[PDB]
Design a protein around this ligand. Structure first.
Ligand SMILES: O=P(O)(O)C(O)(Cc1cccc(-c2cccc3c2oc2ccccc23)c1)P(=O)(O)O
Ligand SMILES: O=P(O)(O)C(O)(Cc1cccc(-c2cccc3c2oc2ccccc23)c1)P(=O)(O)O
Ligand SMILES: O=P(O)(O)C(O)(Cc1cccc(-c2cccc3c2oc2ccccc23)c1)P(=O)(O)O
Ligand SMILES: O=P(O)(O)C(O)(Cc1cccc(-c2cccc3c2oc2ccccc23)c1)P(=O)(O)O
Ligand SMILES: O=P(O)(O)C(O)(Cc1cccc(-c2cccc3c2oc2ccccc23)c1)P(=O)(O)O
Ligand SMILES: O=P(O)(O)C(O)(Cc1cccc(-c2cccc3c2oc2ccccc23)c1)P(=O)(O)O
Lengths: 226, 217
């Protein structure tokens, strides 16, 4: 009844949530993981076809660039145990983002995870990893530029419909709703091309507290903004 | 400090209906609201204001009339005018009035006023992409040297301050294929106020909210 086929969520607020409890950041990450499981569960049980998730990091600015990098590795590493669970729940997993510089072992783990679940018929879960909406448009542009160089494409032949076929998730239903938790009212270079016509829904709720009733609220807001 | 504000103007028609009036009446109050927003922005030190008339030859002629009767005043008021969007198919007379209007004000140093006409964010990115494909075809550019900075140099308004705040009136919470590339880091502010009613107090509310959020985030 919500009529929403594909929801994207900019998750934020985990560190502030922990801070308020008098707990260190790591406890926030723990509670945030639980909230991710819960939103994925809700989406699957509510007939949403695709759910795309972006972890917005409020602390990354204070982290040296080389820690960030290693942080991307732990993510893929953790993503080897979690896939087993996603697969048991009939979830099809896709990673979107610039994974070309990750080491071969990671790239292999990622492809194997997407291959394992590619045939599942449940929710399609897209996880952003090293993703940027401008980078997304740029990688599509590069693919087209390569065709132009080969001599198979004239610059005047490039139109929206063609660039669209080369940005992330072009093969899935278009994003109908973007939710951003944590209070900030910005897209922060998450999807740009893909959100041209999506409903944007912002809530002050911190990610760890964002639960099924908050997700239903966004979906009903969407249904009503029709 | 907000340097560039973009506004998705919407609600003139709904506004006229609530008054029991026709669409033309909503357009008239709408023009007055554009005038007040432009003055407000110029008076409060905003460097660029970008306006997008959201709609769900008569016009083309009015566009000519509008340019002919207001450009001298915008020039006088030190406003730099730019039209962003695909005007490639407007009639030549109008295309020439646009070009001349931008040329006459190209040197002004006050508010840059960007008016969208047949503009779309995807189209904007696509025109930038065509320009880069031309250099690849010419042989002056390798596909793998194309990066964000380079495409950024080929989308509308790259010569101005980055868009800091996007305001959409009328109650919808969508970008509707207005700016996309350009709003990657902008504060987004939605208000149910209908365009004709959008006034200095409403505009101040969006500006104060931007400044406070800049402080908090
Ligand atoms: O746990 P802390 O945030 O205290 C820190 O160890 C960095 C870190 C270590 C181990 C795991 C994580 C972590 C865990 C879950 C999600 C994410 C984490 O780090 C990021 C960054 C960006 C997005 C998501 C997550 C972060 P720090 O160097 O910032 O103190
Ligand atoms: O816990 P369930 O298997 O019941 C389910 O929530 C799916 C799910 C469970 C647990 C974790 C995740 C998930 C998915 C991808 C990556 C990561 C997940 O949780 C973490 C924690 C830390 C790092 C990465 C991930 C998803 P479901 O919708 O399939 O029932
Ligand atoms: O919310 P904050 O910006 O405070 C921060 O927790 C980063 C963060 C944002 C959003 C989600 C998560 C997070 C935490 C644990 C598990 C997972 C998170 O995001 C995903 C995506 C996919 C699978 C698992 C998780 C972390 P931080 O490390 O910058 O303090
Ligand atoms: O600057 P960006 O916002 O583009 C990004 O690189 C930030 C980022 C850097 C490093 C790790 C993560 C990240 C994202 C989701 C889940 C987890 C991340 O890091 C960890 C560590 C341990 C468990 C989960 C996650 C995010 P992104 O991967 O969220 O696109
Ligand atoms: O078709 P008509 O000539 O009857 C009329 O709609 C013309 C009209 C007057 C004023 C504004 C508009 C109008 C309508 C849709 C979009 C835009 C309009 O004006 C601008 C300016 C710049 C960008 C978009 C629009 C139309 P009207 O208000 O004089 O009845
Ligand atoms: O607000 P609505 O979407 O109801 C509609 O008035 C279209 C419209 C939206 C926003 C502004 C305008 C409009 C009206 C009069 C003058 C000008 C308008 O937009 C601009 C931009 C620049 C200069 C003058 C005007 C028209 P409509 O013609 O589709 O009913």
């Amino acid at each position: 009844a919500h009529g929403c086929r594909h929801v994207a969520i900019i998750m934020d607020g985990n560190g502030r949530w922990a801070k308020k409890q008098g707990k260190i950041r790591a406890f926030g990450h723990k509670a945030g993981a639980k909230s991710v499981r819960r939103a994925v569960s809700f989406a699957a049980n509510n007939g949403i076809e695709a759910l795309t998730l972006y972890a917005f990091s409020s602390e990354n600015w204070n982290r040296p660039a080389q820690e960030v990098s290693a942080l991307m590795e732990l993510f893929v590493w953790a993503l080897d145990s979690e896939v087993k669970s996603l697969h048991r729940h009939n979830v099809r997993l896709r990673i979107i983002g610039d994974t070309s510089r990750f080491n071969s072992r990671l790239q292999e783990r990622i492809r194997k995870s997407e291959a394992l679940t590619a045939g599942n018929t449940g929710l399609t879960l897209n996880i952003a990893a090293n993703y940027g909406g401008r980078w997304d448009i740029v990688q599509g542009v590069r693919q087209l530029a390569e065709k132009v160089q080969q001599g198979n494409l004239q610059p005047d032949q490039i139109d929206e419909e063609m660039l669209n076929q080369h940005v992330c998730m072009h093969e899935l239903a278009p994003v109908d709703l973007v939710i951003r938790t944590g209070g900030e009212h910005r897209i922060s270079n998450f999807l740009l091309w893909q959100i041209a016509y999506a409903e944007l829904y912002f809530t002050d709720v911190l990610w760890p507290d964002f639960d099924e009733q908050d997700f239903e609220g966004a979906l009903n807001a969407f249904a009503n903004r029709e």
